[PDB]
Scaffold this active site. Structure first.
Site, mmCIF file in Angstrom:
data_model
loop_
_atom_site.group_PDB
_atom_site.id
_atom_site.type_symbol
_atom_site.label_atom_id
_atom_site.label_comp_id
_atom_site.label_asym_id
_atom_site.label_seq_id
_atom_site.Cartn_x
_atom_site.Cartn_y
_atom_site.Cartn_z
ATOM 1 N N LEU A 69 0.855 -1.172 0.000
ATOM 2 C CA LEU A 69 0.000 0.000 0.000
ATOM 3 C C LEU A 69 0.888 1.217 0.000
ATOM 4 C CD1 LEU A 69 -2.988 -0.239 2.441
ATOM 5 C CD2 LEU A 69 -2.934 -0.576 0.023
ATOM 6 N N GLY A 70 0.613 2.141 -0.902
ATOM 7 C CA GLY A 70 0.252 1.731 -2.271
ATOM 8 C C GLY A 70 1.312 2.242 -3.273
ATOM 9 N N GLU B 154 6.663 2.306 -6.374
ATOM 10 C CA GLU B 154 5.742 1.846 -5.292
ATOM 11 C C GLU B 154 6.235 1.920 -3.818
ATOM 12 O OE1 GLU B 154 5.295 -2.907 -5.423
ATOM 13 O OE2 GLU B 154 6.187 -2.158 -7.265
ATOM 14 N N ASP C 208 8.958 20.225 -1.697
ATOM 15 C CA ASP C 208 7.620 19.622 -1.959
ATOM 16 C C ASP C 208 6.836 19.439 -0.637
ATOM 17 O OD1 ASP C 208 5.378 18.539 -3.367
ATOM 18 O OD2 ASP C 208 6.390 16.697 -3.937
HETATM 19 C C1 LIG Z 1 -0.788 10.809 0.572
HETATM 20 C C2 LIG Z 1 -0.502 9.769 -0.503
HETATM 21 C C3 LIG Z 1 0.762 8.996 -0.174
HETATM 22 O O1 LIG Z 1 1.878 9.487 -0.379
HETATM 23 N N1 LIG Z 1 0.585 7.741 0.294
HETATM 24 C C4 LIG Z 1 1.222 6.967 1.250
HETATM 25 C C5 LIG Z 1 0.370 6.128 1.987
HETATM 26 C C6 LIG Z 1 0.848 5.247 2.964
HETATM 27 C C7 LIG Z 1 2.218 5.186 3.231
HETATM 28 N N2 LIG Z 1 2.676 4.337 4.208
HETATM 29 C C8 LIG Z 1 3.979 4.249 4.486
HETATM 30 N N3 LIG Z 1 4.843 5.011 3.793
HETATM 31 C C9 LIG Z 1 4.462 5.899 2.798
HETATM 32 N N4 LIG Z 1 5.358 6.694 2.101
HETATM 33 C C10 LIG Z 1 6.724 6.739 2.224
HETATM 34 C C11 LIG Z 1 7.381 7.944 1.996
HETATM 35 C C12 LIG Z 1 8.771 8.013 2.108
HETATM 36 C C13 LIG Z 1 9.530 6.875 2.438
HETATM 37 C C14 LIG Z 1 8.883 5.659 2.667
HETATM 38 BR BR1 LIG Z 1 9.855 4.094 3.102
HETATM 39 C C15 LIG Z 1 7.491 5.603 2.551
HETATM 40 C C16 LIG Z 1 3.092 6.008 2.488
HETATM 41 C C17 LIG Z 1 2.606 6.892 1.492
#
Ligand SMILES: */C=C\C(=O)Nc1ccc2ncnc(Nc3cccc(Br)c3)c2c1
Length: 248
Positions: A17-18, A21, A115
């Protein structure tokens, strides 16, 4: 290779999710983590409580970045979801203060996020919010300071601007800024001096914070250090007669 580098065997991917990726997973068996599958040594020199912590990186391709795991997903989803209905102004002004705190730390280090907006804040247990996605990061435009969107002038001061747009996300439960306006209408009308009006039920005082954050003058905007303290103290120093409304 450096000391952030790991081998893939220690990585157990699990649940999707999601640009590429994002999975939930496991590191060295004992450790619940998150992986971003797609340079970025900024996630390496930044370490603070309200920034999502890097754990390890992988390359040669297919590249893997390993972050701390954030249980509640992104702030955008979280605000528009089931939680939104119940979030009230003291939870939200708090989330704000946590984000300002992380940004205040970025400030101290002479970095720029570029951002900053709700989709790039991750949420956790107990309403913890932590800045993430240093994507674009050194040393789209509805959230972007005008001098940045126009002349590439990205600074901590254009992040303050985004912060102010984030503030409107936060208080409209996640709605897109400038409703009914397309990018060129926003760029154009902001150049004319237009600003978002006070959100429904949002105190005038916090919309001034928003207005200070959108001053045409990159240097007349405040510091995150100021934003942090003003949001931490909000309910004693600024709105001590605050009372619950139907939405905020
Ligand atoms: C708001 C949309 C979005 O970016 N979705 C998102 C949803 C769940 C989620 N869970 C865990 N991690 C992330 N993003 C993330 C960002 C930077 C580094 C890492 Br390892 C994970 C999301 C993102």
């Amino acid at each position: 290779k450096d000391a952030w580098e790991i081998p893939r065997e220690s990585l157990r991917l699990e649940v999707k999710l999601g640009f590429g990726e994002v999975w939930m997973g496991t590191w060295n068996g004992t450790t619940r983590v998150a992986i971003k599958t797609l340079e970025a040594q900024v996630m390496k020199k930044l370490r603070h409580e309200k920034l999502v912590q890097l754990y390890a990186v992988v390359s040669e391709e297919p590249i893997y970045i390993v972050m701390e795991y954030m249980s509640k997903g992104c702030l955008l989803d979280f605000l528009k979801g089931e939680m939104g209905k119940y979030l009230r102004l003291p939870q939200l002004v708090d989330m704000a203060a946590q984000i300002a705190s992380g940004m205040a730390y970025v400030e101290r280090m002479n970095y720029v996020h570029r951002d900053l907006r709700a989709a790039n804040i991750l949420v956790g247990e107990n309403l913890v919010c932590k800045v993430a996605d240093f994507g674009l990061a050194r040393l789209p435009i509805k959230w972007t300071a005008p001098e940045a969107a126009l002349y590439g002038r990205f600074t901590i001061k254009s992040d303050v601007w985004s912060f102010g747009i984030l503030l409107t996300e936060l208080t409209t439960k996640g709605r897109v800024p400038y409703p009914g306006m397309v990018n060129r209408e926003v760029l154009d009308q902001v150049e004319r001096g237009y600003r978002m009006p006070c959100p429904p039920e949002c105190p005038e005082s916090l919309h001034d914070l928003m207005c200070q954050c959108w001053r045409k003058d990159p240097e007349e905007r405040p510091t995150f250090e100021y934003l942090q303290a003003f949001l931490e103290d909000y309910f004693t120093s600024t709105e001590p007669q605050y009372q619950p409304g139907e939405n905020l």
